[PDB]
């Protein structure tokens, strides 16, 4: 069970996850890789916004799905 997440550049990250993993947990792994703080992250699967406190299994994210990392930028 591994997942794929595309960033703004078109760059793809690969992640080691389980269907029962929290979304914020995933955001945390992405932080461990790229360095983007979790709160600056907004994740999207199949057009759906992923709540921090839910699990991959809740959103029907199966093996080798493709996620999206959209950065919410502070309004400056």
């Amino acid at each position: 069970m591994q997942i794929f997440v595309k960033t703004l550049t078109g760059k793809t990250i690969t992640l080691e996850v389980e269907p029962s993993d929290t979304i914020e947990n995933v955001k945390a792994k992405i932080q461990d890789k790229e360095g983007i703080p979790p709160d600056q992250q907004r994740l999207i699967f199949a057009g759906k916004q992923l709540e921090d406190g839910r699990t991959l299994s809740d959103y029907n994210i199966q093996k080798e799905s493709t996620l999206h990392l959209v950065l919410r930028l502070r309004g400056g």
Binding site: I44, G47, H68, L71
Partner: protein
Amino acid sequence: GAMALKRIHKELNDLARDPPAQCSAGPVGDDMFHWQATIMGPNDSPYQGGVFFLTIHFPTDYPFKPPKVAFTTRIYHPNINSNGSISLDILRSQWSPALTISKVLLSICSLLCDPNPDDPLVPEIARIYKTDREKYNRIAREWTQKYAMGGSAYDEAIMAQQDRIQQEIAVQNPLVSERLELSVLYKEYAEDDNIYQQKIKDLHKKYSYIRKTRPDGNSFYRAFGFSHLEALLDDSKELQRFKAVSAKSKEDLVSQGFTEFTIEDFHNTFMDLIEQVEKQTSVADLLASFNDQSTSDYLVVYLRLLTSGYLQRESKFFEHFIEGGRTVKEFCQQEVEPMCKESDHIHIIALAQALSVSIQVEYMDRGEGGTTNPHIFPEGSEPKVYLLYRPGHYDILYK
């Protein structure tokens, strides 16, 4: 003139056919001969993380003369001056009429990862790159950090990301699907997943049919609207009351401080949608209306406006029901009025009370039983409109 324009259209067609993720370009508003290119700093560059803008002016005689292309964003590079002029020669002497603006684009994108200290535009940078690469990479990274990373550029880039995403989503699902047997839901989930499948059994107990909507962020307003009009596709008096309150709603909104001329169009689309249902036409026709982009979207906008309106009207009631220190009007300006923002329970109650109508929602996530519990909220009413909630997404249900 003529053939030049036609050609430009052909080139835009080709560039749209196989979109580059890293470097794309397109016309500015109305103007066909003025394009803006957004090219991303390639990874494994110093320019990595940066976003660089180009302007492209197609000569009135085209393809016969090459397009004029220049960086608006400042960049450190031996082949590009701080004036912005690009020094590769397919843009000057080597230009064939058979070349495409796409070729030019990836010629520049290529020029980024692999510069050209042979025929330098900027002698000094050329010298630095050719001799000390450390200093070059460092400086280039600093210049990227300064000029290419601004809070503007990034907005445009992320905008592009979003557009790509719901373009794929758009080609995936239609705005409103035809009435479907909900057995189709069985296909959406793995056989490995028992709990969901059995909750689908339990949903199959209560409801015969399902109508899917686009996961575009507006799915709640879209579903709510369509199903609630289709509900009055028959009932004689309900259509009348709904039409009345929806008609007065505009005046309430205008009186609430919304500028009339803007909301007038959206109100018009709404009332026209009530008009198609007024003298009953088969569901397929109003569905055909809902699958038009701007009509459906205009409707969504108006429903959001109603939501915000009633939210601010009753504001001291909802005030304690919202997380954060935001006031009610701030919450409206942020999480409701703008398009594509997700909707919550507050939105549903607000819209329901706004149109004075009944709603039932079937919550399906992970059950202790197969039971997917209903929620009917006008309190204790008898709702004729049913919606299926799955996490992140709303759909229509037909008993």
